[PDB]
Amino acid sequence: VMTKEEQIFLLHRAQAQCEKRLKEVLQRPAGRPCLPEWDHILCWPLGAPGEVVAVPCPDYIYDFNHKGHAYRRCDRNGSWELVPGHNRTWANYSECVKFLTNETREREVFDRLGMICTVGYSVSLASLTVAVLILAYFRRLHCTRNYIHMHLFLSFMLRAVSIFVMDAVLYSYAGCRVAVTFFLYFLATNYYWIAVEGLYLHSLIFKAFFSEKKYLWGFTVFGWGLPAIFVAVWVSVRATLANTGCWDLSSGNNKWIIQVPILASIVLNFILFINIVRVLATKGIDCSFWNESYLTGSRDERKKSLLSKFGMDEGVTFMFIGRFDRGQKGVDVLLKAIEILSSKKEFQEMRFIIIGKGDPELEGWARSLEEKHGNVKVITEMLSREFVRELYGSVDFVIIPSYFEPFGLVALEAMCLGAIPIASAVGGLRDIITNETGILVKAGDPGELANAILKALELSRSDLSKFRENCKKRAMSFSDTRQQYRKLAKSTLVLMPLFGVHYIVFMLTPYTEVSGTLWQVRMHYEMLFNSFQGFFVAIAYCFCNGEVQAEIKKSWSRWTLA
């Protein structure tokens, strides 16, 4: 706060006061006292012969110990005591300079943290430059998803250029204000383009159909426009009130009108994050395995052989596979529906295969129906997925009466193998299955399931091949779309909480420690994290992308041909 220029002005005023004091003394001389004089720092008073004179360390010297005194001695004749061997006046300034042997200990911390800044931002800028060049060079990488990545890359690149401008003018007034303004703008665009990445992923999953061109236009205004809005309001509120320091943004309440919009994006990302993880499964179905092209013969031949293995004649076959529990997978709903149907005449045309494990009372109930009716088969042992695939590709309908099912991967496996699903209208089954690709029923209602089974029997009297083909295309296009979104979410769902949690934790940690053990470990880690942010984004969206890696391996194989 105290500048060198300010000390010069205060020292000039002290010198002028000393000149006036000496003139007032010379006009009225009396006795033989030591006269006042100016020794370039402070003004000494009249000195009595043979006495020590003590002057408190001057206030206008900021770095002095203001609890001590400077000393002089006055000769018996009335002359200031001299330095031995020279014609210079002697003085004792040891108390004023007591706590002024600081030298440099803070240089070690400032040089380490500054090196971490330049190293981290250089690696980030170098990795982002080759990342944006790769996405623009290969024509196979040109799509809306990569265009959003290039905007996010550019925002972190300009942030790296801003800090290189700030420390450049530091190594040497209004030129500093525009430097920190551009930095805070680029800092805001970074967090808002992270929210764009979350909004784009959330839109792909929850919007069945939209225009990517128009959404990209709205994302550009969201990413570059809104940060420029509340930053301009920040500069408007700042320059008007006063003209304080260039880097003391944290001191006043002016920092909250920029941190709050940045916090709003983090809250928005936490909202988008929760919606996506509740719907997007961590892993899809094994597409290399669940395919009907692995089976031989026609479906009619496979069903007749299957029912013969179980000791039954040909009939419309329904299958259940899953855990035997009371209020979840819904085997209790199916067992009650089988009892309702057991008195109908249409029951003799139906065949049932129940596979699962769990509650003993539901296992005994299933075993009871198997023993009571010759068209009910129950399997409680463990089955290989090869035999499960044989069942999906042989039965007519698969019954999925779950009380809740967030993803419904069992439906996708059966639909890929031609089995028409009869499932509860809950969770993922509701989004996968439509009227043209299955039957949906209210959850927990044995009567609605029994009626759906009756409608499935009347449907089986006609050819169902076209129905089975629609179920295959639906499961295949749904899993293809889901696998594409999972690759983008593999990195987007990581960068959203990583940047958000770090920003919140760093904001909630104050600067109170003042270069303590807590301060140096927080300053070291936050400098490491913030400087390598561009390097984190470059790895997440380019260096680890499956399409980018396949393109550089293609180029390296063409350049390395034996």
Next chain:
Amino acid sequence: XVAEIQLMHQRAKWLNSLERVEWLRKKLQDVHNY
């Protein structure tokens, strides 16, 4: 704000402090010569 901002602020105060102390040690040499 972010850690890189506080570093520039501490650096600014540290360079100004260094400049001021160097000016004071120069005056202390003038007092010594006087």
